[PDB]
Every structure is written in structure tokens, then in C-alpha cells.
Amino acid sequence: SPALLARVNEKKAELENLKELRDLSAAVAAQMEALEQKLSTLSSGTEAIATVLANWHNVLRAISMASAKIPPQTLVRIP
Amino acid sequence: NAFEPAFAELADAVADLEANMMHFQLMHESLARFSESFASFLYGLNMNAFCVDFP
């Protein structure tokens, strides 16, 4: 009986530890959600610079087509 | 008969003129290539801006 009183005290300490672990795991997952948001923002910035490469790539090809002229209308696209 | 060394001096002057003119020809060609690269560069730059003029 008194030994079992000490046993339940051990279990009390264990439960306190477990509660802290549970709280920490919840906080961990919360941080993962926040992390995912920031990573999405990063990818957005990368997409922006991909747009920049699209600009210069079209520039280069447009010039090369004019530069490679070795033997029209004005219809273009103006968003 | 009268301008023998004078014509020798002329030969030297035209030689110097040939040197300077070759440098002019070369350097002008260098600048021509330079200008053509930067011209086509900014040309295509204007073309991209001329096509998709940003807000």
C-alpha cells in the first residue's frame, strides 16, 4: 500500500511529463503549419524571378530571330 | 630636282597618315561592333517593353 502510494507519485510525475510532451507536440505541428506558409511565400518569390527569366528569354529569342535574318504586319499582343 | 628631300618628308607624312588612318579604321570598326551590340541589346529591350509594357 505505501509502496503503491509511491508508485502513484511516480505515475504523477510521468503524467506531468507526458502532458508537457503533448503540449510540445502540438506546438511542433503549429510550427510546421507556419513553416509551410513561409515556404509558400518563398516559392512565390521564386516564381516572380521565373517571370524575369521569361522576359529576358523572349528578348534573346526575339533578337536572334531579327539577328538571324538571312533571306510583315504590325499585329502583336499588348496586355 | 628642287623638292627631293621635301618629297621624302611627304613620304614620311603620308606614312604617318597611313598609321593614323589604320587606327581610325580599326577603332571605328571596334566601335561599330560595340554600337551594334548595344543597339540590338536595347532594341530588343524596347521590343519587350513595346510588347508587354508593365503597369
Q: Which class for B43: exposed (0-12), middle (13-18), buried (19 or more C-beta within 10 A)?
A: middle
Chain B residues touching residue A57 (CB < 8 angstroms): none
Chain A residues touching residue B52 (CB < 8 angstroms): 55, 77-79
DSSP letter at B52 equals S
Contact A59 B45 (CB under 8 A): yes
Rounded to whole angstroms, the Cα distance separating A56 from A77 reads 17
What cell was used for A31? 510550427
Rounded to whole angstroms, the Cα distance separating A61 from A65 reads 6
Rounded to whole angstroms, the Cα distance separating B47 from B11 reads 52
Taking the CB of residue A55, how many other CB atoms lie within 10 A of it? 14
Q: Is A77 on the interface with B (CB under 8 A)?
A: yes
Q: What angle do CA B40, B43, B48 make, to 5 degrees?
A: 125
Rounded to whole angstroms, the Cα distance separating A44 from A65 reads 32
Identify the residue whose cell numbers are 561599330.
B32
List phi, psi (to 5°) of A74: -115, 15
Resolution (A): 4.5
Name which of A51, A56, A60, A63 to mutate to probe chain B: the one with the most chain B Cβ atoms within 10 A of its Cβ: A63
Helix (H) or strand (E) holding B48: helix B4-51
Residue B44 CB partners (closer than 8 Å, separation 6+): A59, A60, A62, A63, A66
List phi, psi (to 5°) of A32: -65, -35
Rounded to whole angstroms, the Cα distance separating B7 from B4 reads 5
Which residue from B minimizes the CA distance to A61? Answer: B44
Q: Is B40 on the interface with A (CB under 8 A)?
A: yes
For chain A, the three-class secondary structure string (H helix, E strand, C coil) is: CHHHHHHHHHHHHHHHHHHHHHHHHHHHHHHHHHHHHHHHHHHHHHHHHHHHHHHHHHHHHHHHHHHCCCCCCCCCCCC
Helix (H, G, I), strand (E, B) or coil at B13: helix
Chain B residues touching residue A67 (CB < 8 angstroms): 40
Rounded to whole angstroms, the Cα distance separating A58 from A65 reads 11
